[PDB]
Amino acid sequence: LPNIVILATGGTIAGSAATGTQTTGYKAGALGVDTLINAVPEVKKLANVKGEQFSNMASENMTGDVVLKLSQRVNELLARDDVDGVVITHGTDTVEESAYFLHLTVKSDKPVVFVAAMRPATAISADGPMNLLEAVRVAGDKQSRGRGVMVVLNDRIGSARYITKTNASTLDTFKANEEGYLGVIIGNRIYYQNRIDKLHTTRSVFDVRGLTSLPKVDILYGYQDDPEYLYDAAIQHGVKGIVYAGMGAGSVSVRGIAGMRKAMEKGVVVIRSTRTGNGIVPPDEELPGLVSDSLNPAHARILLMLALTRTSDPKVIQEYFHTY
Amino acid sequence: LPNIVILATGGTIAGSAATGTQTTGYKAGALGVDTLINAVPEVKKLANVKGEQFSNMASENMTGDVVLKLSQRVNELLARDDVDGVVITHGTDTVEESAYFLHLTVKSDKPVVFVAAMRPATAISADGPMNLLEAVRVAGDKQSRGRGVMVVLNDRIGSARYITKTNASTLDTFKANEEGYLGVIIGNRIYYQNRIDKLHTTRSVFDVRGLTSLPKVDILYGYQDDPEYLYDAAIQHGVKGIVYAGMGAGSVSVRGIAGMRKAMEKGVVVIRSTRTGNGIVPPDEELPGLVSDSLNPAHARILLMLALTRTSDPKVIQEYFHTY
Amino acid sequence: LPNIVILATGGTIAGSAATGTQTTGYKAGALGVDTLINAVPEVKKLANVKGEQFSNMASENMTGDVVLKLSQRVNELLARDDVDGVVITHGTDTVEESAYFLHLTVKSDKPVVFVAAMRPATAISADGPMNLLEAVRVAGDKQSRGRGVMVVLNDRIGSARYITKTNASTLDTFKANEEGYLGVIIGNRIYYQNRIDKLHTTRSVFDVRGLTSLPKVDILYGYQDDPEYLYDAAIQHGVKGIVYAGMGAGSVSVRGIAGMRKAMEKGVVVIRSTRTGNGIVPPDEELPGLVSDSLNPAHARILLMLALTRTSDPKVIQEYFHTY
Amino acid sequence: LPNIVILATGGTIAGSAATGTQTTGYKAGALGVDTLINAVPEVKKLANVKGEQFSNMASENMTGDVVLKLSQRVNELLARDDVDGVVITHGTDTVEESAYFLHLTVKSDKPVVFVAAMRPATAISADGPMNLLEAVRVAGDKQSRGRGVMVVLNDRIGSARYITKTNASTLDTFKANEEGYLGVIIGNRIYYQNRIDKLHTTRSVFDVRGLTSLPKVDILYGYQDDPEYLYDAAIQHGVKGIVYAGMGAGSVSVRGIAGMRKAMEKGVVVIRSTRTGNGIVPPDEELPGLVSDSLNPAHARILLMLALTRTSDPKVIQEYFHTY
Ligand SMILES: N[C@@H](CC(=O)O)C(=O)O
Ligand SMILES: N[C@@H](CC(=O)O)C(=O)O
Ligand SMILES: N[C@@H](CC(=O)O)C(=O)O
Numbered sequence A, B, C, D: 001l002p003n004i005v006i007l008a009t010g011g012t013i014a015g016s017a018a019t020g021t022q023t024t025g026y027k028a029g030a031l032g033v034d035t036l037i038n039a040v041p042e043v044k045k046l047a048n049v050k051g052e053q054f055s056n057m058a059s060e061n062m063t064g065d066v067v068l069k070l071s072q073r074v075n076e077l078l079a080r081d082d083v084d085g086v087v088i089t090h091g092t093d094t095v096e097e098s099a100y101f102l103h104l105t106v107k108s109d110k111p112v113v114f115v116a117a118m119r120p121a122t123a124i125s126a127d128g129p130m131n132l133l134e135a136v137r138v139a140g141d142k143q144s145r146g147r148g149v150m151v152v153l154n155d156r157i158g159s160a161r162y163i164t165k166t167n168a169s170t171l172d173t174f175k176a177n178e179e180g181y182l183g184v185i186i187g188n189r190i191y192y193q194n195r196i197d198k199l200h201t202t203r204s205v206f207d208v209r210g211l212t213s214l215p216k217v218d219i220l221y222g223y224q225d226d227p228e229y230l231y232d233a234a235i236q237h238g239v240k241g242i243v244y245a246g247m248g249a250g251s252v253s254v255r256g257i258a259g260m261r262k263a264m265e266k267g268v269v270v271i272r273s274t275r276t277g278n279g280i281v282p283p284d285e286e287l288p289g290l291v292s293d294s295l296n297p298a299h300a301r302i303l304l305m306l307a308l309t310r311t312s313d314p315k316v317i318q319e320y321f322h323t324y
């Protein structure tokens, strides 16, 4: 059997409420990893699992300094001969951010699978137990190697680069509308469909081993009447990058243009992304900043933060956006 | 034949580029309304059309003061016995905002149909001509009355309350993943599928006749490491409301909580929405602010602005979010 | 509390397998209704429920003669003052057919909610418990009246007319891509979004009280090299109608045209539907047969069977396809 | 510039109607290939194109014997040093069948791109011109090599293995809900997202050079009351295989089981697929026949026909269903 480490960070998957139908007033990140494992003893037929408690928080409180430590820990684990893969239990709300960070920074082809749940462990029809079992199956399969970081929920295997939480509250929320899933798990069998045609993991140039902090990057929304003062505030607080969750294809109002030009004059890198949820922001030399390709704003922030650890050259940063 | 006014505001539908494949370096909002009409002379078999040029701008520059005028003009037009419906040509980037504004403020059951195009008029396979023809068909059909404000592109009829631009750059971008379309136009025939179960138009309390400006509302994004200083900036600039494009189901970090509590102390109304793109943000009294129900951040901003013209009572505002 | 009858027919919701991960070799339709109710005692806080065992079969074996009796029983129940609504447990494979049959033949505005499960009751993270509780919530809410027959799974409320099983094996399979959901159930609260703009239930002309069988209707697939001999076989076995699950928009090969013309010469009514999964098959007088509007093949069969209890007139039948 | 052959077979892309809004009463496959080319002279900046007229038919009339000749011709063309790629203009209705056939039988890494249109060439906002330009762009890019056969419409590049016509009548009908697109074409640039994780073209065992006909395979639908006599008819007419477009996950009624057992006793190979549109049909040794994995019925028929040119062995055929 493969040796899988379950590295727990918190989330609703580790939530415990007073009744089976209670959806508020409980902490998302209360139960320990061994309680998760022991609720699905079937996992022991799939792998030799060892639980490690990395943190226990709601993912809306996950921070880059913590995700950096997570990446460093996972790199240490996967460097061991006695670790075949890692499953990371996490909150759903920012799992796409943490997962994409590890996608770019983990220097191994051994699987790294993020798993989460939309219902707490105490819920009627809780999804966490099956999601964890699926995640372990994926992490221990030798066919799962070399595929980049994955996010597994609801019988689907999503690439960290494409997968996003698309719905505030449903079990099927994690989708990649234009890129689909890497694979699916049906009837206790994994079906791989796609390999992502982007750089990642052992083919990624990003390395943050030995870093202890990351560049500051903020995200500003685009909308009718969007204000220039938010750009001024970000600049004043020393951001190194701004990701613009733009109207349409990174379109920018007269006010946003003024903000962006100010930022660029102070050496801030601006990435024009989109608030729409999907698709390509194409190059446009008449507008300020760089473009995000198909990265959504949350992902774009992660790639920009990592880019800024190793370059300040806009040409190189733009090329990263087209290749990672 | 029905008498339809085509009220033009700009957009890529009125864009004109130097070649058939050029997608940048042209102004979205350059062609006049009569050029659009004359490019589809078939529209004169469907309706007696009259063009009126309201504005000619890219929709990323549309502002609430201008949308207020638009609403007022459309009400004047629909008050006339010689006007059976209005088609509004507009940019795709913010059409959802303008349309939802009119959905709540137009005091007639006569059809109001927004139309737009993802490719400029000069493009190969431009979508504007057929979109405009479909929109005119919709606006003139007696079966279209009483349905709320509609957005028509790509053979689909979307409710202004549910429809959003979901993709930065595709023709099929306008979708309502959970709510579907009101109807479709296939083979020159309209097929109505749904009526929205929300208040609108003639049953809406919002009336902005005579107003000349609207309450200031900004939108802030939720993400890992989201900073409190953006709340401080918005407060300092005198916002009346803040819409939060939250992680997951309006989930809030410790920093966002501190920001939101500060804003609420100053009398700012905070609405928690979602950055995910779809779904319900459920109530949670322990978190700050009101919740957006299934309104996305752009729509939630429009409803909040209108709500604040009538009330500062949280109970009443929250009920608007559940019913409009 | 509302009085709700849970009328059980079988399905995977009532399936019981030897382990938590076994997905084959168990009978869908083994557990009794009271075992379903007793697994979710929370239901007794939502309604006064009474279980009735109508049948216990896998839904692939559900037949029109049995669905007729199901409709007749439901009508009997809803005619009672002591019944406020009904939930029908059923297999997922043909629930859309049974549900649409009841949608057209149930003469009450009281809610009728079909419910099902993709994983058996014994499965890890079984969906049936929560699906049943959601269904009971929907059936007992006074806001649910007059909406037509509903299908409830995975926090979604779908209209019987639009909802279909879109995926062979996932929990989120029931979707209506173009029409959306009537509503959703999130955080123990129902959010109604739409009302279907079609005839149903109390406004439907179809009445089958007193019938003991239905007219025979088969479905033939369209594809490259589709054979004429399948039309001959159907005609020889006495079908009254044929639904063609056509290529594209009910397109027909030379072979299919010959088969259809032969069928129509014998008095068979032919409906051209689509194998695609969605959309409108538009009228085309140059092709044989009537068109299915947006009814998929399984639904189109149900409507044709019901139509043939009332009329043989093509004009009238075609109008049913456009209104039901 | 690359040298691209445009091999025309017909379809609505080659349709010509009397007015810009006419959607019936015109032949789909009337215009010649040069007339398509001459409508988009921009193509000359992308490639040196040569048109060749293979056929001119509606795709509902495409037959396996003709697709076999199409595959043979494409193989001849791509064996030439002066051909870099091939674009095939085709009807939308069965493009997925012809494309998947070529995906398994074309013995080259040079791109083969099928292209089609939902609106005829004479239509207002006809999609064919831009679809053809995109297809030529894809066929001529050196990055497009080795990706398997592609289907290009509406700015999307779909794998022939996953893409299907999902809507009877809309421009955006070609989707792969679970597998996404291989890439997209926005702003005159190709963005590759995925590589399919299945065998195709140069790695495929299927070679039909020298064949003039193929094994007979029919498709039978699954539904309530599905009749055994259709199996008897297929058997009597000498089918070598039957693809069952099953209820749910290839579920079979008692009648279908009896039919399938009869077919198998006569040496017919039975593949259980799904009518649902998407997803995996899992193995189940208690049911008759082989399973289609995620192939939909139309694709399953194509694979089974090709498999039968080589083997009758169920173990090998089942493996093909899991790897092609
Ligand atoms: N707020 C929770 C939500 C979840 O996990 O479903 C979290 O992200 O930690
Ligand atoms: N920027 C343009 C884009 C479009 O209309 O497609 C607009 O919103 O005005
Ligand atoms: N074959 C089962 C499948 C399910 O219910 O999920 C049924 O329809 O009865």
Ligand SMILES: N[C@@H](CC(=O)O)C(=O)O
Binding pocket: C248, C251, D010, D011, D012, D013, D028, D057, D058, D059, D060, D090, D091, D092, D093, D094, D116, D117, D118, D119
């Ligand atoms: N019946 C046409 C439809 C199209 O091309 O859109 C064909 O398949 O040939």
